[PDB]
Amino acid sequence: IVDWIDERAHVREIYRTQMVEYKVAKNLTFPYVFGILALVTFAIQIISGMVLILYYKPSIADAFDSATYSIMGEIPFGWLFRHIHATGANFFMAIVYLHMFTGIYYNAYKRPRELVWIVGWLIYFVLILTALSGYLLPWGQLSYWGFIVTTEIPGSLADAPILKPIFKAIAETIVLWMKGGYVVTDVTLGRVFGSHVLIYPLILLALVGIHLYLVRAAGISNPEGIEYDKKKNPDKFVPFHPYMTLKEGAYVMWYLAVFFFFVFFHISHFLPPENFEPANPLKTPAHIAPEWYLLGYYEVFRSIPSKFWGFVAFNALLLLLLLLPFLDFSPLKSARRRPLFFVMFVIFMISSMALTILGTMPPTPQNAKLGLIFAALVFAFFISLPIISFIEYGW
Amino acid sequence: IVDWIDERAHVREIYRTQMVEYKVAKNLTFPYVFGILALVTFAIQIISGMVLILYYKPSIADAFDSATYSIMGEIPFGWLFRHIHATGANFFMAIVYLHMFTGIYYNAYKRPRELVWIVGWLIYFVLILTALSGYLLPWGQLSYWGFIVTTEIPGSLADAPILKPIFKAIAETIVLWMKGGYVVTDVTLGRVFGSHVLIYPLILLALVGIHLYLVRAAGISNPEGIEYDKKKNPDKFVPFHPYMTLKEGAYVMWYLAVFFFFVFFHISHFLPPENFEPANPLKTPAHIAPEWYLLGYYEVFRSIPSKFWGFVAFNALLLLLLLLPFLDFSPLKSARRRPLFFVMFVIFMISSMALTILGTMPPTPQNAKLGLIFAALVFAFFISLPIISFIEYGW
Amino acid sequence: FISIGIGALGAVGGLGALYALVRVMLEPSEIAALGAKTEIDVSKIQPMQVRVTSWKGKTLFAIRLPKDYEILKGHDVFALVGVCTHLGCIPLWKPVFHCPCHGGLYTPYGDVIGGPPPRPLFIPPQKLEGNKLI
Amino acid sequence: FISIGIGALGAVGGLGALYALVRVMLEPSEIAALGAKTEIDVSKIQPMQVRVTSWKGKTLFAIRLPKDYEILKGHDVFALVGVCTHLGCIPLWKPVFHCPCHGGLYTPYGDVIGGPPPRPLFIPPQKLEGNKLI
Amino acid sequence: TWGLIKTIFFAGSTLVFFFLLWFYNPFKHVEHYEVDEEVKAIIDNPWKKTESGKTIAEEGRELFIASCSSCHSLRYDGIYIMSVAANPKWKNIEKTSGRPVYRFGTLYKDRFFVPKDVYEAFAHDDIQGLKASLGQVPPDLSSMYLARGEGYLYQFILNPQKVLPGTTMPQLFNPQFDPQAKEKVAKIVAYMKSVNTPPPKESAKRTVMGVIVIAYFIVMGLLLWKYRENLLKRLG
Amino acid sequence: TWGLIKTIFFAGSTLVFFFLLWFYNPFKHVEHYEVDEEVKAIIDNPWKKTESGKTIAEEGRELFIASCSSCHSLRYDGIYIMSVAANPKWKNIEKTSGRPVYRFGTLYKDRFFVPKDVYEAFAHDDIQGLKASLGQVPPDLSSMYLARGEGYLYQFILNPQKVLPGTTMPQLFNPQFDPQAKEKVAKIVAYMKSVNTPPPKESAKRTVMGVIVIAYFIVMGLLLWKYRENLLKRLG
Ligand SMILES: CCCCCC/C=C/CCCCCCCCCC(=O)O[C@H](COC(=O)CCCCCCCCCCCCCCC)COP(=O)(O)OC[C@@H](O)CO
Ligand SMILES: CCCCCC/C=C/CCCCCCCCCC(=O)O[C@H](COC(=O)CCCCCCCCCCCCCCC)COP(=O)(O)OC[C@@H](O)CO
Ligand SMILES: CCCCCC/C=C\CCCCCCCCCC(=O)O[C@H](COC(=O)CCCCCCCCCCCCCCC)COP(=O)(O)OC[C@@H](O)CO
Ligand SMILES: C/C(=C/CC/C(C)=C/CC1=CC(=O)c2ccccc2C1=O)CC/C=C(\C)CC/C=C(/C)CC/C=C(\C)CCC[C@H](C)CCCC(C)C
Ligand SMILES: C/C(=C/CC/C(C)=C/CC1=CC(=O)c2ccccc2C1=O)CC/C=C(\C)CC/C=C(/C)CC/C=C(\C)CCC[C@H](C)CCCC(C)C
Ligand code: HEC
Ligand code: HEC
Ligand code: HEM
Ligand code: HEM
Ligand code: HEM
Ligand code: HEM
Ligand code: FES
Ligand code: FES
């Protein structure tokens, strides 16, 4: 029964405290589902990678003979669990982008949520590495070369800068770090496999746990902006169960329907067809831009004429998210409450979608001009947050 | 500083509640360290397996060429992190045996700790599989054959029993389950590698977390036996920090010293020398008994003349630990309080050490007689717990 | 009704997901049984000639002899797991047949006549269906 | 003092453990630089003859010619990364040297004279130490 | 309301972003090759029976092993270079694993799959006149269908000089005075498609189960929604 | 006290259990072979210099490649069968990875390590007279030292008929009228030891760091103990 487990585990005292008397806000909108959806996609990736690790082999002469021959034809339902994996990777990138952007919107990074945003940025940085190093593994014609392209980006740092041209042969993230040093060999493939498969998901679970605890410790920020009305204002909370637990439970099922649509009926873009060719280190494909979640940065890169300054802009665009809680400082919180932050956020969103879309097209001079025009608008959102902050402080 | 992190994460409110005002018992003895030591050894195994997964290769033609050539000679400090791994596996078996046996001693399985013992038995069962499937991986001369010996044990079940001899070709844990079916091939090695390396440690972390929560939910059982004196009896708790947190912190360091002794100076029994020969499926080694943590059961096996009944005894000796909380029922708890349970526990401990020690010697008829005499004493401890329980109920 | 319809639906979904997971991970189905049939036509082997095959693993012999351990009496067709005993070499046919690694000799029925190996070759099970050995 | 001695000792232990972990995982040290020296004695290559080698990966040529893109002027000894351009074949020496996959021709200095490839072979860096090319 | 404008903007932009990011990016100018439409039914159903009791896939397999296995080694089906015939062992190809080709979902005990490193060391490292004469090894036609497409595979074969400017692969099926080559190339492409595409029994089970899974999750979501709506009425 | 009897019983039994379970189980009767004591210094220090500027390990390597590489393929050092010489490529052994033998902690660019499946398919599957005549392939002497021991390796070589009753491996160094064979076999075993045992520089760094780690953890434990003792006095 349940009373026997109740007396020994206190299951009902945990249930009545975590669900029935939690008292989340009532006016929670739809983009407050993206965290639960990212957690569900993380679970999907773990469950479907536990199946792939049984048959994938981190050898150069055996990779792409496991993931393409064994996984796809030899193993029952192996096609399905590679489809689920390669679809959930892209869905997990997209849901995390939506989550962090509609957390930027409601400004869920202000007091006292400065630390949850730092842990979330660590989540994002290590997720980039988990989805970047897991793409070399199929060892396809463009997988190898998109790993090479992405691992030579830290090499433009060593190129002679405008100032102090001693950066040559220093911070060698090429030789020491990934690409293994002058050759991508079997040892490097095994190292990337092991890291991607067990070192990164463990520090993903740890950081997701810390993040979920820090969300509860600071409380869900309501989208209105008053951020609380303590000891008063009832009839606007309608506690967690069953108001929210069944709304999220329906959004999760509908999201899984949209997910298993791509898994079954349209995967010709998650398993790209010209990646089904075994990689040879002598023939370079034509269009070898990195994966879609890194194209918004790859367009800021290789658009500035200097490569060192392009890499510096690449890194500044990623560092301006750690400082983003420390960068915007105002008593006002939401975007329903800041009419000047809404226009900057829409500029940021549009000009950040446009960068990822320009990152797919071939590098023409007009494409470079457009990617620079949009990079200027992306940087404007960060170099104007303190201005709007200083304006709103004077009301 | 710390106040900034305090305001956003509530770190001091967690510290003052989990350490300074926890109020564990004062008379806790030494064998109450084995849980923390098993947790530390679990951490050691995870940390040192994250390094081994980078270079181990789950192919028949490449296994034992990674773990013996690459890991040991080619990789810097790879000798050290294979030494730490193969030593921590045996230390993790030994510490878990000590923990569960000195938890049997103080009867930490009675009310209300029935569920923590079930979760601990699940820990033990899945730990057997994690240390059993991780031993096939080096693909050594005796690793392959000790996997074969252990995976043919469920095959004696299919042998014609005394009753209902239809068990032939049913419950085929040989073909369907491990050994892959009639051949240990490259696919089976890859499957065992993937399972051992990521599927078993994940359900180890989950079960260890559930176990650690269930220990707190039921409270540490004090070794005396009164099990509490609620709302009274002060000056005998001296709360968790710094009374216990620094006693455990010193025992952990001394245990790690004893550990890194074996890691560096005596490992000729954790990496057995005749396992440094590449496995061939045509030549069987002389003495191919399973690993030491399964020898207490392997001696109950292959000592009874019947193989089916030997396997049934193997399984009953393992099932009589799940029922052990439901098997012993008495108001008295400790072994300092039950003078009749102490003698049965010492019989159990001695006759269970003797079984693992007899499991190493070759199978002579005198060895079989001794392993049966000791198997009788091991079963006596389980078929007498209800008798002592019924006697003590009448006081 | 809904509060039980969703329970039944979730149970069916969990059952299907567990079926898929079992079928991927824990199933060597229909490829592990290689081979339990092992078609070996008897009318192809000549007298005093041995055909090398594989049953339940490697390796297996197919011995045929016209006249005459000794588990079975005269059947003239059988199969023995052909791998030497004490160190695991492969004996060569030809009338006894030995292995040249250490000098172990074997009679066509399995027993040893000059034995470096301690024990003979264990007879694997067999079935007779017309002119096909299992 | 103890409450700071244990802190210093734990910090040293953590530093050593992190050093070991870095040295195992994140270090292709002293084996990735294969090869930055690439001893290529100039007095061994004959005029109008190409030696196949490997610098910073595969592959590399070692061309020597007595007389005469064109990044460098007349030095008579240099090295070009030898792999065809538009599809990545290996050109064969012999005076131009071409690759027979598609028909791409190359002058000994890298440029193309009949080009299926769009661009010539990029010159990798080089150093001159007596009679040894890098 | 203004919230509605916010909704159909912040959702419309994301939908039209993921649309042209995940399918039909209209700004990439990758070219398209198509089957000649002369037959276009030899390739649609390679498992379609024909006369002499042979399907089109089996006949394409024989055409490939007879006219194409002299330089190309289509593994995943046990086809290797005919020099020597067969290029794998000779003697014991079984002692390699080396396993018999077990595709979806039926195995073929008469053909074996040899790893990429065992092969090309036993076979092509005692090098025959392929890398020498041609210049490049005819790479592999195992997963070339999934990587090129039926259109590119058909338009490449029977006219390699048009798709690639210069290529030492011959015409080898010359049209415009041999009217029997187009269907041969179609059978070859249909065979190469039958190696990487599920049969009509398997490609249908996947469709049925993918429809059932989506119809399962949608119904489960709407059932949970209706359950929440009903439970919020007993309370308020 | 009675608690003391409980302590030195429940700890004594566990200690004497793990003793004869983890080192020197006195009830296992595995036999022991020992070096002939004729030299016993050729094998102790294989890196010990000799005349002609050659160490004993290098001379054992030459003796092995000259008299033993005709049937045994000691990989992990680049030694393969001399038929053909060398049995690996011939031509491109570099295009296999195939990497140069990089043991602890110095690499040898003149010898290459070829995987187990690439080798024995290029080399022994164009089978020469080893599996035919002998009956079994001379397995491998790469990690035979770690698996047998110096005693077993010495007593096996120069008298294989004594360790194993019948073995087609010859004496190949016959004593009792050739007094120059014992030191040759000792040099061979010393070479085979130098492939799997760290040099005197590396086997010493491991000892020093293993002493320092234990002395670190013991001191840390006793420091934490003294800190707890001191902190329990400020409170009680
Ligand atoms: C068969 C089926 C096919 C399926 C096709 C694929 C599926 C597509 C579905 C995706 C739909 C996403 C919906 C998100 C929007 C939710 C609704 C909304 O409108 O979200 C708004 C803000 O959310 C927010 O920022 C979040 C929205 C902004 C996020 C921008 C995402 C950019 C994506 C990545 C960009 C690359 C980044 C590069 C690195 C810098 C809410 O603003 P409010 O002022 O509170 O309005 C209140 C009203 O809603 C009242 O009801
Ligand atoms: C260089 C250095 C070399 C190192 C060599 C290796 C290291 C060895 C160290 C191991 C020492 C273990 C110490 C355990 C004993 C702790 C002390 C003790 O005595 O533990 C007793 C009970 O613990 C208990 O059951 C626990 C003891 C019983 C556990 C039995 C373990 C059996 C092992 C596995 C058996 C195989 C099982 C097969 C499957 C059935 C405590 O009983 P009390 O009545 O409360 O006494 C109170 C007094 O102590 C007051 O102070
Ligand atoms: C997926 C399969 C499941 C199995 C997974 C196993 C793991 C965990 C099991 C699941 C957890 C069980 C749920 C227990 C929740 C009950 C906690 C609780 O509710 O107890 C609270 C204590 O919390 C407290 O100390 C908080 C204690 C500190 C929490 C620290 C843990 C967070 C980090 C964990 C993530 C890993 C990373 C670790 C590295 C740092 C009491 O509340 P208070 O604030 O003190 O009182 C104030 C009142 O006004 C409100 O109540
Ligand atoms: C069954 C059905 C399989 C077909 C049924 C049979 C006859 C058809 C026969 C059949 C069809 C083939 O196409 C096939 C192909 C190749 C070889 C053989 C076959 C075959 O034999 C679909 C199974 C696939 C579904 C898509 C499972 C999803 C895969 C995992 C990633 C899910 C992991 C589930 C975990 C363990 C529970 C987590 C619960 C969490 C809270 C969410 C709850 C949502 C829901 C699970 C209730
Ligand atoms: C450094 C020293 C290395 C030698 C120093 C240098 C000059 C010597 C030079 C040197 C020596 C060689 O033998 C060597 C061999 C091969 C190639 C190269 C070399 C070499 O260059 C010893 C390092 C090994 C120790 C044993 C680390 C243990 C391995 C892991 C398993 C530990 C994981 C640590 C985690 C991340 C923290 C967890 C904290 C937890 C709460 C416990 C706290 C205890 C303590 C850590 C404070
Ligand atoms: C004269 C030897 C030879 C013959 C015979 C041959 N091939 Fe080729 N194949 C080649 C060469 C050379 C290339 C060029 C490789 C390249 O351009 O990268 C090639 C390339 C290809 C490609 C891939 C080209 C690309 O860029 O994707 C395909 C597909 C192909 N051939 C199909 C076939 C088929 C089908 C047959 C049998 C009907 C065949 N070939 C017969 C040698 C040959
Ligand atoms: C006549 C061919 C031949 C020669 C030459 C040869 N071996 Fe052997 N080796 C064999 C055979 C046959 C065996 C037997 C394998 C077995 O019994 O399992 C063997 C076995 C061995 C074994 C392992 C035996 C065991 O049971 O562990 C070692 C070690 C060994 N030989 C060492 C050497 C050394 C060192 C040399 C060179 C001085 C050498 N052999 C030369 C063929 C040869
Ligand atoms: C958590 C977020 C993760 C992301 C975003 C991610 C991403 C990816 C991607 C993009 C691929 C390429 C697949 C393809 O191109 O077909 C991949 C492959 C792979 N992933 Fe992950 N991964 C994640 C976690 C995991 C986990 C937890 C495992 C656990 C085993 C895992 C195991 C694997 C394996 C073995 C492969 C190679 C198999 C193959 O290529 O088919 N991954 N991953
Ligand atoms: C695996 C990845 C992630 C998981 C599982 C996850 C999970 C969650 C969940 C469940 C919530 C609460 C529900 C909600 O707010 O929708 C949340 C909140 C939050 N997350 Fe994440 N998240 C992830 C990634 C990220 C990233 C990458 C960032 C930032 C870069 C981030 C920043 C935040 C913030 C600021 C909040 C607070 C929302 C608020 O208070 O309104 N998260 N996260
Ligand atoms: C948690 C308890 C675990 C136990 C008791 C255990 C046990 C073992 C054992 C006995 C071996 C054989 C090593 C040898 O004989 O030299 C082994 C090897 C291995 N373990 Fe574990 N293991 C555990 C967890 C893990 C984890 C978490 C990982 C994560 C990567 C892992 C990865 C490996 C790998 C890759 C090998 C093969 C490497 C080699 O053989 O040198 N293990 N394990
Ligand atoms: C990875 C394996 C394990 C870990 C990390 C672990 C951890 C712990 C810890 C830290 C404690 C509290 C401290 C202590 O009692 O010493 C505990 C208590 C306990 N454990 Fe475990 N344990 C493990 C395995 C097991 C096993 C295999 C069993 C039983 C078969 C078990 C049964 C118990 C019981 C009954 C208690 C309660 C002790 C009491 O209340 O006095 N544990 N465990
Ligand atoms: S192998 Fe046949 S006698 Fe030892
Ligand atoms: S590959 Fe050299 S010409 Fe195309």
Numbering used by the authors:
A (entry chain E), B (entry chain B): 7 to 401
C (entry chain D), D (entry chain A): 8 to 75, 96 to 121, 131 to 170
E (entry chain F), F (entry chain C): 3 to 238
Verbatim from the authors:
Cellular respiration complexes convert redox energy into a transmembrane electrochemical proton gradient, which is used to synthesize adenosine triphosphate (ATP) or to transport various substances. In summary, we solved the 3.3 Å structure of respiratory complex III from the hyperthermophilic chemoautotrophic ϵ‐proteobacterium Aquifex aeolicus and revealed the structural basis for the hyperstability of proteins in an extreme thermal environment. The two cyt. b protomers bind to each other mainly through TMH1 and TMH4 to form a stable dimer. Several residues unique for thermophilic bacteria were detected that provide additional stabilization for ligand binding and for the structure of the whole complex.
